[PDB]
Coordinates of C-alpha atoms and ligand atoms in Angstrom, one line a residue:
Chain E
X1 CA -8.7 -2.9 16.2
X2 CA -6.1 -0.9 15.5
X3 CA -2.8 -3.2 15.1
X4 CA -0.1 -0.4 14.6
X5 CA 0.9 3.5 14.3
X6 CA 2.6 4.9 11.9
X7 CA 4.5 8.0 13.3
X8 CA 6.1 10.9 11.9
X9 CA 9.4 12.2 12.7
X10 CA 10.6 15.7 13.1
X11 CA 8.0 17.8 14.7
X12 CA 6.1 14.4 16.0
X13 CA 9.0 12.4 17.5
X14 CA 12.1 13.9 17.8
X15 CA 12.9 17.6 17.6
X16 CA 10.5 19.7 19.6
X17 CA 8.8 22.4 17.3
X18 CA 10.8 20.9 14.0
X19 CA 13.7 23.5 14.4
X20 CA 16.5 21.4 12.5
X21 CA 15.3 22.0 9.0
X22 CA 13.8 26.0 9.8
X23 CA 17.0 27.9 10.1
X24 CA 18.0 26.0 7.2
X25 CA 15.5 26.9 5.2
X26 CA 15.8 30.9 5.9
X27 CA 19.9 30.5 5.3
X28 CA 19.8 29.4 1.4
X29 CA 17.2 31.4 0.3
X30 CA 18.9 34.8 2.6
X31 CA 21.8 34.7 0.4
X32 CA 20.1 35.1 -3.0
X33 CA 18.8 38.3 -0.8
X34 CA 15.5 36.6 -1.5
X35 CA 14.6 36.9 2.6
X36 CA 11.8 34.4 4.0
X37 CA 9.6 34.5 6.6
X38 CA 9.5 31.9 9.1
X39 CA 5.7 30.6 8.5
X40 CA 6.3 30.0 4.6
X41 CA 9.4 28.4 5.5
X42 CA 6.8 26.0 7.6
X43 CA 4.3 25.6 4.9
X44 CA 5.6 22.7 3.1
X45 CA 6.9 20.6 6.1
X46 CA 6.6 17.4 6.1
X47 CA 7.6 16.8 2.4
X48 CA 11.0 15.6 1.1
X49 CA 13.4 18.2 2.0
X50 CA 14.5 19.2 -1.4
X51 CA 10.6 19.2 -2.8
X52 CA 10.4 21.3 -0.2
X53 CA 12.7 23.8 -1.1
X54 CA 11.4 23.8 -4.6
X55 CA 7.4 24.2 -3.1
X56 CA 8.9 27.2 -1.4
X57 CA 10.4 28.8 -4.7
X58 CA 6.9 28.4 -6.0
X59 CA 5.2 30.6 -3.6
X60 CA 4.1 33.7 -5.5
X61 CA 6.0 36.1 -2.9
X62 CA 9.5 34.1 -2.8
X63 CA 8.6 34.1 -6.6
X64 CA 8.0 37.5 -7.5
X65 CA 10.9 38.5 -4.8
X66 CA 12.9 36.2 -6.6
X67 CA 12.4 37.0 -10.0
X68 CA 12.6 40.5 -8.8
X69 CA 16.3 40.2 -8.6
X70 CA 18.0 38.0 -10.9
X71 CA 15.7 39.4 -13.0
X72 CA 14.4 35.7 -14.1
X73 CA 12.3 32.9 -12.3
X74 CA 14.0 29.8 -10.1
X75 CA 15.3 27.1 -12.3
X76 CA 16.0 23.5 -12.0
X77 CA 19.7 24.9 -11.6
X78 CA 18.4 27.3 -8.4
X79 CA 16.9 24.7 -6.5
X80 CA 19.5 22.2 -6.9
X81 CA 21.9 24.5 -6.0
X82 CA 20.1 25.9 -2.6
X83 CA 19.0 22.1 -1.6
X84 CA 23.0 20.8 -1.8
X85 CA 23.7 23.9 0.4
X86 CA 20.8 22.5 2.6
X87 CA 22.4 18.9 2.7
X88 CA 26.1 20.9 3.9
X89 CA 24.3 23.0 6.9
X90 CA 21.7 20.4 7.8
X91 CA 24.3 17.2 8.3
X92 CA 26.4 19.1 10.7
X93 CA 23.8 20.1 13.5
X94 CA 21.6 17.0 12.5
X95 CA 23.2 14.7 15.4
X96 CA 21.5 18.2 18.2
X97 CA 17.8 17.1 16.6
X98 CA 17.1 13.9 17.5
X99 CA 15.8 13.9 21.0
X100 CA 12.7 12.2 21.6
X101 CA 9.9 14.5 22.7
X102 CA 9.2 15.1 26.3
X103 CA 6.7 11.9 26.7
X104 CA 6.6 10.3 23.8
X105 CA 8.8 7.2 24.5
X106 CA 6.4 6.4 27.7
X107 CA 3.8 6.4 25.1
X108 CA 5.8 4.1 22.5
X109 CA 6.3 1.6 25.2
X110 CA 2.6 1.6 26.6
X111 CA 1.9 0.8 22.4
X112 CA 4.3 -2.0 22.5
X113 CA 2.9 -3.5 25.8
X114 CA -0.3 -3.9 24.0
X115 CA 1.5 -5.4 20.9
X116 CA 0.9 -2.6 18.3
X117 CA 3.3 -2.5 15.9
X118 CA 5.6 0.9 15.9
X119 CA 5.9 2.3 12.5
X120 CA 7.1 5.6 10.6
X121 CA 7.1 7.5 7.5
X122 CA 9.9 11.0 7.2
X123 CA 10.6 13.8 5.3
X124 CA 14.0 13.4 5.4
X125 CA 15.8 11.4 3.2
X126 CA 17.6 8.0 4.3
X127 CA 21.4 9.2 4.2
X128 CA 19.5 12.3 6.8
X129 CA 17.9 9.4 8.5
X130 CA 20.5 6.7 9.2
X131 CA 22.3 10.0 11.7
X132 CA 18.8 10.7 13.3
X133 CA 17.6 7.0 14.3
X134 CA 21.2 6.2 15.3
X135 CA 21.1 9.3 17.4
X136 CA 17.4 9.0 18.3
X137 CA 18.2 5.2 18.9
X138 CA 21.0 6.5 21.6
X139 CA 18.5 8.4 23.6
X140 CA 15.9 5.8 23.9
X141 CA 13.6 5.3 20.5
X142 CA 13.8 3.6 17.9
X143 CA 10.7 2.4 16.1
X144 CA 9.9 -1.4 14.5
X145 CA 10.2 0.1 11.0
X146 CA 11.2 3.2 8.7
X147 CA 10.7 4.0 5.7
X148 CA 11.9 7.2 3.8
X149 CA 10.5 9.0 0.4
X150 CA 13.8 7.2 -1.0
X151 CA 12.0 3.7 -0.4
X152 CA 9.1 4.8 -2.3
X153 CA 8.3 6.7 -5.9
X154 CA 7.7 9.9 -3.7
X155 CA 7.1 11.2 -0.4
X156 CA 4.2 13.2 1.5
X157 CA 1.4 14.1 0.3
X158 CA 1.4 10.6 -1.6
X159 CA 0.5 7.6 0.7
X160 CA 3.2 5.5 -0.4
X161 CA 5.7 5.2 2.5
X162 CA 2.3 4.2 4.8
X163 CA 1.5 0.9 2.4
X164 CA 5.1 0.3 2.8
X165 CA 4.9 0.2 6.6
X166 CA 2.0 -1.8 6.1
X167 CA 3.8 -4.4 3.8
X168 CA 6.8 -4.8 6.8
X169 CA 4.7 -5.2 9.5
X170 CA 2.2 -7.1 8.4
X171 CA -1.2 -4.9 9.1
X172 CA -4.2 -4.2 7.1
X173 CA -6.7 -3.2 5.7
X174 CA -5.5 0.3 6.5
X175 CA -8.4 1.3 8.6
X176 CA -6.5 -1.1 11.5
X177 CA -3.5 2.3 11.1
X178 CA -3.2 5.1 12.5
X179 CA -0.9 8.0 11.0
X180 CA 0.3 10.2 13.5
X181 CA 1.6 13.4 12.5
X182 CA 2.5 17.4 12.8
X183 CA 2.6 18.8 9.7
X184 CA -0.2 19.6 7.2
X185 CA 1.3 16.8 4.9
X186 CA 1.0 14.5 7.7
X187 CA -3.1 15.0 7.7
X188 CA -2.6 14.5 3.9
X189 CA -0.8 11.9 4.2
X190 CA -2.8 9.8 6.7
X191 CA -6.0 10.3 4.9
X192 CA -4.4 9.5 1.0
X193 CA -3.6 6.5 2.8
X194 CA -7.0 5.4 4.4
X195 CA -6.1 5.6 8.1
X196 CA -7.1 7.0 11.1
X197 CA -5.8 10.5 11.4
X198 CA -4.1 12.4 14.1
X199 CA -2.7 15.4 15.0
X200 CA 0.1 16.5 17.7
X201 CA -0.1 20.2 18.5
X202 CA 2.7 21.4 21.7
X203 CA 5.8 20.2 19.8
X204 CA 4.7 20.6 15.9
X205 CA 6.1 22.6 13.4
X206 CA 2.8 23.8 12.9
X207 CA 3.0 25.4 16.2
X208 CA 6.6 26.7 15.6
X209 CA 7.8 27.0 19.3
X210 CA 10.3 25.9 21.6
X211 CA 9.3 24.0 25.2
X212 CA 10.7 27.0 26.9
X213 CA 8.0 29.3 24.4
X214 CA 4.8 27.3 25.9
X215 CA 6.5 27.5 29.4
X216 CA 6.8 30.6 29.4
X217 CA 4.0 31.9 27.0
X218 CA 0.9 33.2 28.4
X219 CA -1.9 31.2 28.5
X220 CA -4.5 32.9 27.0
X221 CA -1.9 33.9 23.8
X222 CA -0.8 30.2 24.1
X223 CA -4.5 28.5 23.8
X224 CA -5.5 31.1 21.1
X225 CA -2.4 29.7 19.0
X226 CA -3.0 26.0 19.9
X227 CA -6.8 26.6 18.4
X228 CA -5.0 27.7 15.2
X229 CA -3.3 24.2 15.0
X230 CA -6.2 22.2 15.8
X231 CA -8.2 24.1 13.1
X232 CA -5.6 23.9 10.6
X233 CA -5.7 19.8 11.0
X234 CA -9.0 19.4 11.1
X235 CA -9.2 21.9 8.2
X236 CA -6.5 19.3 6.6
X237 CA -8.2 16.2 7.3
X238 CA -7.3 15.3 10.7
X239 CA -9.8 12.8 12.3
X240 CA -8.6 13.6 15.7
X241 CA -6.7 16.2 17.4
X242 CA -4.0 15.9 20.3
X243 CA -2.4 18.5 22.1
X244 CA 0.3 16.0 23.0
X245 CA 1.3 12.4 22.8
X246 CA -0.1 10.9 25.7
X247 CA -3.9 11.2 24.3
X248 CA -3.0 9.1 21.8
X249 CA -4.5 6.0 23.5
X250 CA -7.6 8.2 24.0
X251 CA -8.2 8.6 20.5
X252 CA -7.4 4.7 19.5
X253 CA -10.1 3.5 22.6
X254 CA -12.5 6.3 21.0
X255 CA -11.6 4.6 17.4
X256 CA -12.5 0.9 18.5
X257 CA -16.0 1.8 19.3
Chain J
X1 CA -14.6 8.2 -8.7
X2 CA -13.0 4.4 -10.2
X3 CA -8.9 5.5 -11.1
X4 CA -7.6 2.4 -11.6
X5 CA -9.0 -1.5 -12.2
X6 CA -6.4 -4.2 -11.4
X7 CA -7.2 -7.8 -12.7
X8 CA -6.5 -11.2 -11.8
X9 CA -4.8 -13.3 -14.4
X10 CA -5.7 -16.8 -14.7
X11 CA -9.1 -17.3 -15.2
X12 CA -10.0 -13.3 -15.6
X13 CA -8.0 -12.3 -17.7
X14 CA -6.5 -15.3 -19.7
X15 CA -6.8 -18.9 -19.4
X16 CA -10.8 -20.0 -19.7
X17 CA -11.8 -21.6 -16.8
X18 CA -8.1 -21.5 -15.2
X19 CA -7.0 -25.1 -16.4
X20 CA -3.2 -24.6 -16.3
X21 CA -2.4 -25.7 -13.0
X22 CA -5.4 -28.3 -12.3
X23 CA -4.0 -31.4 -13.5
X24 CA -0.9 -30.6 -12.1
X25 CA -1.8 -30.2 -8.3
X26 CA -4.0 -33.4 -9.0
X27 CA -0.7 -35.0 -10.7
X28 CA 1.4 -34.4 -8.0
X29 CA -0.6 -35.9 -5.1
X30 CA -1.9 -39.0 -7.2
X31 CA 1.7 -39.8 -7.6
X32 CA 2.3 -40.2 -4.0
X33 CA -0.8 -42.3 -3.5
X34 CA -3.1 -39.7 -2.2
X35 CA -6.0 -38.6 -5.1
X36 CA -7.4 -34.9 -5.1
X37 CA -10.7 -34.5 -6.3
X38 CA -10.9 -30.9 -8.9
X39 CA -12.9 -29.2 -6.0
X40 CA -10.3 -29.2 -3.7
X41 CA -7.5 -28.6 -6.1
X42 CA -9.3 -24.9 -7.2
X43 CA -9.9 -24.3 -3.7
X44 CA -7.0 -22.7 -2.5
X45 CA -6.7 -21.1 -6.5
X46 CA -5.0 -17.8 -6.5
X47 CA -2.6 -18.1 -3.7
X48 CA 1.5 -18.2 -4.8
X49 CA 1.5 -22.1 -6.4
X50 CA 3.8 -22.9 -3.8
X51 CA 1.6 -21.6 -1.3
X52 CA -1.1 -23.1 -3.3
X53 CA 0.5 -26.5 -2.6
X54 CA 1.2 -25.8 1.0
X55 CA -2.4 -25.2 1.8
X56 CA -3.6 -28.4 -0.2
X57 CA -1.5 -30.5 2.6
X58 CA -3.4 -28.4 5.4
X59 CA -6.9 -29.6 4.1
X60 CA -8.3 -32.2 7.0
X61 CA -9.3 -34.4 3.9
X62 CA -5.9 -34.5 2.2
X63 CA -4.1 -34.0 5.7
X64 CA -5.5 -37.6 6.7
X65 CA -5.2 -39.4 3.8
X66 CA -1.7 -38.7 3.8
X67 CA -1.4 -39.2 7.4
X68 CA -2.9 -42.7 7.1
X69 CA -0.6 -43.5 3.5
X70 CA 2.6 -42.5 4.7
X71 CA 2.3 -42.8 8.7
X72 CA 3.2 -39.1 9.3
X73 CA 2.0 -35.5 7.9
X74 CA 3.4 -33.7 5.2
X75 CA 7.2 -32.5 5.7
X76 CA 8.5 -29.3 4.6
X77 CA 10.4 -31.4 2.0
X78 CA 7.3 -32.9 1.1
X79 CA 5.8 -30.1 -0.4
X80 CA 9.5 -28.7 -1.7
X81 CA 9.5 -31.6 -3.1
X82 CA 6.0 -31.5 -4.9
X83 CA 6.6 -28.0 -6.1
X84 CA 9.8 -28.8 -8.4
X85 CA 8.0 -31.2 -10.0
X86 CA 4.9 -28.7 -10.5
X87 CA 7.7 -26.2 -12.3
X88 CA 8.6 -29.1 -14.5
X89 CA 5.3 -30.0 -15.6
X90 CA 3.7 -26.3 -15.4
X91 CA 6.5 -24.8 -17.2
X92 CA 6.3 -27.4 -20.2
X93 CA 2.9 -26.0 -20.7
X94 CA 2.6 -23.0 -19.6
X95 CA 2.5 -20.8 -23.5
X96 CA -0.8 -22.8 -24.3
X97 CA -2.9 -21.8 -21.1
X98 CA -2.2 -17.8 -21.5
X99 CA -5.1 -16.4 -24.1
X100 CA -7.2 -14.0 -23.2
X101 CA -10.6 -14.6 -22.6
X102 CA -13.5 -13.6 -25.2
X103 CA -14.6 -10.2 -24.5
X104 CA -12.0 -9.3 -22.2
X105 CA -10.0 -6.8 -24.5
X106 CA -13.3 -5.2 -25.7
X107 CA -13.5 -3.7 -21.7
X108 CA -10.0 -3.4 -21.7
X109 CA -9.9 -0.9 -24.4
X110 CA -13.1 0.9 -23.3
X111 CA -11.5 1.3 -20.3
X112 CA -8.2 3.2 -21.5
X113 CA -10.4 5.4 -23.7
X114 CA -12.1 6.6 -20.1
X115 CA -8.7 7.3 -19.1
X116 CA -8.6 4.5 -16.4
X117 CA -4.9 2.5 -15.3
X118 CA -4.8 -1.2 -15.4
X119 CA -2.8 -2.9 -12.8
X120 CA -2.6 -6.7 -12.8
X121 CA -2.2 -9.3 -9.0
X122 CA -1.2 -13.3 -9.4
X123 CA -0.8 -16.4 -7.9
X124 CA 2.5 -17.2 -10.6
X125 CA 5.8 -16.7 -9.6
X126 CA 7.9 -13.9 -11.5
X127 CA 9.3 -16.7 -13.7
X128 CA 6.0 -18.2 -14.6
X129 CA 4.5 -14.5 -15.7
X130 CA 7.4 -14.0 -17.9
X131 CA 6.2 -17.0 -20.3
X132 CA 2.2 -16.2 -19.7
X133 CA 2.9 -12.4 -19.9
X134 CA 4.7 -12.6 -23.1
X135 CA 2.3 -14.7 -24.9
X136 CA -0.9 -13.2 -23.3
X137 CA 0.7 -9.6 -25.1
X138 CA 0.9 -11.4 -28.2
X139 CA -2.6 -12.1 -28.4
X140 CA -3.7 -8.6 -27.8
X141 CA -3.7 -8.1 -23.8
X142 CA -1.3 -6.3 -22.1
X143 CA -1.9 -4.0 -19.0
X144 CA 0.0 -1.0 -17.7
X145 CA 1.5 -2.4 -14.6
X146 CA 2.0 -6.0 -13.6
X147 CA 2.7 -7.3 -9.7
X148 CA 3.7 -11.0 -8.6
X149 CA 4.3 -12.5 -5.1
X150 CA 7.9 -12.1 -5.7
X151 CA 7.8 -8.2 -5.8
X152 CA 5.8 -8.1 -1.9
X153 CA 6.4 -10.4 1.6
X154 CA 3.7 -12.7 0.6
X155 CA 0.8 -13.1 -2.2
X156 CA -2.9 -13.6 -2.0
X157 CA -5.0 -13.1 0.3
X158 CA -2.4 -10.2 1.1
X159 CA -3.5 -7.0 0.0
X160 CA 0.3 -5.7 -0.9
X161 CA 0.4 -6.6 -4.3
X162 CA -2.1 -4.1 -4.6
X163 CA -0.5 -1.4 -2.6
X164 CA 2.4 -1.6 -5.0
X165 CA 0.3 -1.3 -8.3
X166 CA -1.2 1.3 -6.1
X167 CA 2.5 2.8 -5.6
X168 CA 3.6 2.9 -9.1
X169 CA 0.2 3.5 -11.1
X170 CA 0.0 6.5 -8.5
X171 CA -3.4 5.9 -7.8
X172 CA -4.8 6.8 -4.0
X173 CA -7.1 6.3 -1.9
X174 CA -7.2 2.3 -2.2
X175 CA -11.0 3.0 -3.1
X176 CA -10.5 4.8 -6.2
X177 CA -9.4 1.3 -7.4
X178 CA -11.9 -1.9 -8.5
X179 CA -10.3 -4.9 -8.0
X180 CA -11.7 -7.7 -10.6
X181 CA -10.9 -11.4 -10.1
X182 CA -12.4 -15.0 -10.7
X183 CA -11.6 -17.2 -6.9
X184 CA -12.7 -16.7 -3.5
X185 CA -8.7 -15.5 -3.0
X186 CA -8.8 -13.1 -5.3
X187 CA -12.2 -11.4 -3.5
X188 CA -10.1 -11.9 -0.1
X189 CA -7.6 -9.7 -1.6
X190 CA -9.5 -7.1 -3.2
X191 CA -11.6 -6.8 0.4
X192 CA -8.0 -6.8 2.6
X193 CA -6.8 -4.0 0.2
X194 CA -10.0 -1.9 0.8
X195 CA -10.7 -1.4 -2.5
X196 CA -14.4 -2.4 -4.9
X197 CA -14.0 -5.9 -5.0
X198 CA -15.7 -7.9 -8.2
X199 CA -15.6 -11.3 -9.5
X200 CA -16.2 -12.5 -12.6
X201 CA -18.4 -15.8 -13.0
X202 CA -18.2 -18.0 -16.3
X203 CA -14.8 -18.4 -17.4
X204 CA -13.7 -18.0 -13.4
X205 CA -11.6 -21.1 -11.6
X206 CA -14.9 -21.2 -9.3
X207 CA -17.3 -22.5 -12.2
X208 CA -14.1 -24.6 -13.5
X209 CA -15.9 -25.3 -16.4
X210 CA -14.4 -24.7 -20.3
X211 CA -16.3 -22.6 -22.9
X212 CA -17.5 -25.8 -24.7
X213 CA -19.1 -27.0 -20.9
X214 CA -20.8 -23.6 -20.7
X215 CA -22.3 -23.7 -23.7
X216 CA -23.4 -27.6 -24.1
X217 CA -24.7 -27.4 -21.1
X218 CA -28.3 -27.7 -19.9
X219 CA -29.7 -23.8 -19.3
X220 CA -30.8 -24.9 -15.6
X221 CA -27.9 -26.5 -15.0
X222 CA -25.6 -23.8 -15.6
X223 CA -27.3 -20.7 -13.9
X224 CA -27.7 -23.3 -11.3
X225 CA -23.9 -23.4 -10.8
X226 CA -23.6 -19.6 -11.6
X227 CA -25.7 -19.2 -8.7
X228 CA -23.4 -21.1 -6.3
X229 CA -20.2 -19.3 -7.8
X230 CA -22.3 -15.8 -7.4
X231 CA -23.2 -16.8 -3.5
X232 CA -19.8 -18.1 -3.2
X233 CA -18.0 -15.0 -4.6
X234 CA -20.6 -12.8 -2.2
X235 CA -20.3 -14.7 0.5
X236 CA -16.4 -14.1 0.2
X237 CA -16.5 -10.2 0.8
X238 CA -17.4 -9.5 -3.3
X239 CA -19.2 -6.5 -3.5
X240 CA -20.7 -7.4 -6.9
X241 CA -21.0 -10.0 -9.1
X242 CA -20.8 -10.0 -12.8
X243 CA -21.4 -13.1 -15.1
X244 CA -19.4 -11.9 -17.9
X245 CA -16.7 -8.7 -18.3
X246 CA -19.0 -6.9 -20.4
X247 CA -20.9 -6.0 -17.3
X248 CA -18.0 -4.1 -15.7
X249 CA -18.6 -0.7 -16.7
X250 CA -21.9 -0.7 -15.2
X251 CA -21.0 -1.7 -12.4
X252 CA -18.4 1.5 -12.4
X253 CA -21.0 3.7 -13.4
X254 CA -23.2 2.3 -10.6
X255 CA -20.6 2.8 -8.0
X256 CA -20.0 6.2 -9.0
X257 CA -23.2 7.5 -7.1
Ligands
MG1 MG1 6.3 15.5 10.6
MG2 MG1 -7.2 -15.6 -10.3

């Protein structure tokens, strides 16, 4: 019996394709003339912004770039630095990514009918956090419980925001949980913590595209990239793979048999 | 592969036999003209005392006898009542019921050399610990991390003090963690927190006997009642049984394949 979920935020909830945090990412790191790409920028999502930023200073490429021009490696000092210009840029278009996904709040409310708790674990902090669920909250979701890598001694992979969720509402063992999620971290994160794991593909940052890209993209291109995602779960630790929200009950039936 | 082992206090770690609070629960319920026999005041053992004290009044057999005594069933005040005189008593006491058990340490230390965390769950409130944890340290035991009811929403059978030793000895999955206790709570907890669950026979609150019992006692007699405390322990969700804490490791080792 599965008694609650534990959903993910950006990328899973709100904020189709997890676009609020890429730009961001490509700005900071553009200045220091170090230049990005849009897939590492993806890589780590799902962790704590600012570990985040620091994972992506650790990839040999931004690394070697890096070093390549200040003619030294990223310290401590770097990182902090490029995160508090993250914080300035990210706060002020914040409040534009918090719309609930196409038909996830149908879904939330089919859970709730059935009495399953409605839980979530984020990469953003809590400060980030109290502007998306108010805003979220506006446009029709707000879950039974929250928790943030601020509440805990750290945030994805580590499975302590999901015991925390657990605590609140009540539910265990774990197996009677299901993690829901869009980012690599999210399988981690799910399976550290000894639930059920699932993955969203049309809407994930592991995906990377807008509605209007799968609109308009052509099937065959669009299936081929969906295939990627599904393998990159599963490859991850997924124990199930969605291509959107409203499978999700497919996947708990399945489970409680 | 076994991370972490987290311990029960009373009657595991320290206090042979768990005799601190016996007389007390007894004490207070003779004193309002209802008599408890030593079976049903262990019972409940392990629980948060004032949950401990709460679940005595929910026995049928107590439940009547109070029923029939005082015309009515126990009131919230009742057992609010009961509990400040259990502190007074408890407390008064408390530094002489918090040695650790014979060969106890010997594990202990075996078990840090193998580069394994100790975490510790109880039934004592925050306040209590501080006494019992102060003197148990004196006498040679101390483990790394220590969690009470007062830190989660609720003690035994809950599995959330587990989840936070889990948190901050930064251990994960919950498997990876061997859960060793002495009652039928403590196996309740170490099942609900999906984790190897253990308990520990002579010495336990279970047997209830002291060292001196154990050992002028008749040798059919006492793997006679070892056998009901094994069953018992089993019956409860224990996935092994071990007489003494010298038998722990192998038990580790065994699980380990
Ligand atoms: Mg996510
Ligand atoms: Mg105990």
């Amino acid at each position: 019996k599965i008694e609650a979920v534990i959903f993910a935020w950006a990328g899973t909830t709100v904020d189709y394709g997890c676009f609020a945090p890429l730009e961001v990412f490509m700005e900071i790191f553009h200045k220091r003339g170090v230049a990005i790409t849009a897939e590492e920028a993806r890589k780590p999502m799902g962790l704590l912004k600012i570990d985040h930023v620091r994972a992506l200073t650790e990839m040999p490429r931004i690394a070697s770039e890096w070093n390549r021009v200040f003619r030294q490696l990223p310290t401590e000092a770097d990182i902090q630095e490029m995160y508090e210009e993250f914080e300035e840029i990210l706060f002020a278009i914040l409040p534009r990514y918090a719309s609930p996904i196409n038909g996830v709040k149908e879904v939330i409310a089919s859970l709730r009918e059935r009495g399953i708790k409605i839980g979530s674990t984020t990469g953003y902090t809590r400060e980030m956090m109290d502007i998306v669920a108010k805003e979220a909250a506006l446009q029709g979701y707000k879950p039974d419980f929250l928790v943030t890598p601020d509440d805990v001694p750290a945030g994805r992979p580590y499975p302590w925001m999901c015991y925390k969720n657990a605590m609140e509402l009540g539910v265990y063992p774990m197996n009677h949980m299901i993690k829901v999620g869009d980012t690599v971290s999210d399988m981690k994160e799910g399976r550290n913590a000894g639930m059920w794991t699932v993955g969203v593909i049309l809407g994930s940052s592991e995906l990377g595209l807008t509605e209007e890209e799968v609109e308009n993209m052509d099937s065959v291109e669009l299936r081929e990239k969906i295939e990627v995602v599904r393998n990159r779960f599963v490859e991850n630790g997924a124990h199930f793979t969605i291509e959107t929200m409203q499978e999700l009950e497919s996947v708990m039936e399945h489970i409680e048999k």
